[PDB]
Paper text:
One of the largest groups, carrying a single catalytic Zn2+ in the active site, is the M14 family. Although eukaryotic CCPs possess deglutamylase activity and are implicated in processing modified tubulin, the function and substrates of the bacterial family members remain unknown.
A potential cytosolic metallocarboxypeptidase from Burk­holderia cenocepacia has been crystallized and a synchrotron-radiation microfocus beamline allowed the acquisition of diffraction data to 1.9 Å resolution. BcCCP consists of 384 amino acids and forms a tetramer. Residues Met1–Glu112 form the N-terminal domain, while the remaining 272 residues make up the CP domain. The N-terminal domain folds into a nine-stranded antiparallel β-sandwich. Here, the catalytic Zn2+ is coordinated by two histidines (His171 and His268), Glu174 in a chelating η2 interaction and a water molecule to give a pentacoordinated distorted tetrahedral geometry. The active-site cleft is occupied by an acetate derived from the crystallization conditions. This anion, which marks the binding site for the substrate carboxylate, is held in place by electrostatic interactions with Arg226, Asn235 and Arg236. The BcCCP structure displays an open configuration and the BmCCP structure a closed configuration with Tyr320 directed into the active site.
Numbering used by the authors: 2 to 156, 159 to 383
Write the structure that this text describes.
Amino acid sequence: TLSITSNFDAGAIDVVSCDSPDAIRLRVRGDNRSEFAQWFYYRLTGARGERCVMTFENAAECAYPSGWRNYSAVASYDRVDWFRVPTTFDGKTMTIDHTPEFDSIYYAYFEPYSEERHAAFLGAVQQLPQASVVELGRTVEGRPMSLLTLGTPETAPKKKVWIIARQHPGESMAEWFVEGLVKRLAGWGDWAGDPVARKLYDRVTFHIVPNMNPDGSVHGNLRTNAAGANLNREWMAPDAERSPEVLAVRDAIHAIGCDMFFDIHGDEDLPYVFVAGSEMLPSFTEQQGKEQTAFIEAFKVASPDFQTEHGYAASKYKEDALKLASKYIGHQFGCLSLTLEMPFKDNANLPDERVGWNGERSAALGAAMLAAILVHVDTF
Ligand SMILES: [Zn+2]
């Protein structure tokens, strides 16, 4: 007897039919208070050594159907080690065809990043002499909005570098990226002995929000918070009831100041790591151009995964572009301001059939970007 369950952190699925392994019928559940549908995460038990054919009947009705083109789902026996599994898409339905090796398995859209993991990581990070953690406010559902500051005393004002992640809760790659970056700043693991963090603290103070959408995350949402708001459309006029997550963070950025800004996302459609810059802003000066180009050049050197060939086609500027964090910040502060995008699929330039794009590659990217930040501040 097969059983599909989803009542856990970030769980999401609607089961249509589940009584023959070769005829499992499913629907992407969708965001809790929004029409956007794309994230899925479920547990399947009772299928050891049985070929499971799991068809997502509403695949074409999802937020980004091209997200299913050349895409493989991820799976795990224990929530620790994740791997890609055989998946096909015909523009109408999506099907995972996989034979579980053990009694209990999970399938998901991307390697998850749980609330527990967040709490364990921040609970350890706060113990570093250079760390502090401040609760800026509460989410819709009373979860903390936590700001991690990493820095040493100013004896000359240090540059304020802001990194926010996971405004879109299903983009768990964003929190993995922050974890890799923070681990390097901590001098943990293989980062012990590395001089980049030390040099950085002489020039820069970091202000980091690892999870911009705690509620959306646990809800199994892709794009919205628990009230149905797209947080990355709330930056020009956030609300205490609808978008307290942005209200609290935007207030802190204004109070604290900002010299460099990075908004960390994942992209459904494109199999590339890329940035969206501020060049479309009418406020984009020659010096800003010089600075953005030079950071991008440094990031290309720091990380072979990062590239500029592929990305969003930069359409004409419209006033509502300021609803997006990196544009709002770019316009308001006149500083280096970027959206960074990681793929749900793989990096097509450097594919990995076993894992595609994942937690470890996202984290390596975050650690690499630190080295580009250092190069950058040492130049400007
Ligand atoms: Zn996003």
